[PDB]
Structure 1
Amino acid sequence: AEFKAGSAKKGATLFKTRCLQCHTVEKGGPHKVGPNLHGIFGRHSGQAEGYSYTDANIKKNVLWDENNMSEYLTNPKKYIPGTKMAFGGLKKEKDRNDLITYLKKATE
């Protein structure tokens, strides 16, 4: 994938509609169904403390950046077979770009 910068404002509405039920982004926000996403960028998958990941997510051992995140959110199970993240995917390029723009800033 090729991340282009988008609207953080729409990315927040995208996050809050499609991600917030399973995730938080603030520093020190609680783990829910999924882990807190603070400092997700520049961190390998499966390394947030306090959350029990799938083996699949740990062994993927992917250093998250803008681009591989875009691929992941298109179809999570396809990028990480075995993941227990039950999310179909953000199919539209512009929605993924909008969200990741928000996510960069919101996870500090």
Structure 2
Amino acid sequence: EFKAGSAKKGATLFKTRCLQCHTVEKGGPHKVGPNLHGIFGRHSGQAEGYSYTDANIKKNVLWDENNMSEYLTNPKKYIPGTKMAFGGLKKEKDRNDLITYLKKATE
């Protein structure tokens, strides 16, 4: 399960693996992927001004640290049909660190 880690390590992971497609700040733009401000406690597929797959929408995930960790392990396994082109983060430590960063960066 998710355990608080290092947002410092997390930020580097996010920057090298996610930032290309996602911004995190309030009012930051949608790009290849949606802006993630407020993602934790929001349902999947709900950010306005972004065109999602029906798959992402229908999943009805209420994003939290634990289901995010499962998603990021292997996105297409968690949401078959998703257009997020990301293989996954296999190490629990990396997901813990990334998610620690993301919670703080998107709140």
Question: What is the SS of the residue equivalent to 1:42?
Answer: coil
C-alpha displacement of 1:85:
0.2
C-alpha displacement of 1:52:
0.6
Distance 2:51 2:15 in 1: 23
TM-score, normalising length from structure 2? 0.99
C-alpha displacement of 1:75:
0.1
Q: Which runs of 4+ in 1 moved over 6 A?
A: none
TM-score, normalising length from structure 1? 0.98
Gapped regions of structure 1 (runs ≥ 5): none
Distance 1:48 1:90 in 2: 24
Distance 1:53 1:39 in 2: 17
- Calculate the aligned-residue CA RMSD, in Å: 0.3
C-alpha displacement of 1:64:
0.3
Distance 1:9 1:26 in 2: 17
Distance 1:12 1:49 in 2: 25
Fraction of identical pairs, as percent:
100
- 1:50-90 per-position Cα deviation (integer Å, ceiling 9, x unaligned): 00100000000110000000000000000000000010000
- 1:25-62 per-position Cα deviation (integer Å, ceiling 9, x unaligned): 00000100000000000000000010010000000011
C-alpha displacement of 1:16:
0.2
C-alpha displacement of 1:3:
0.3
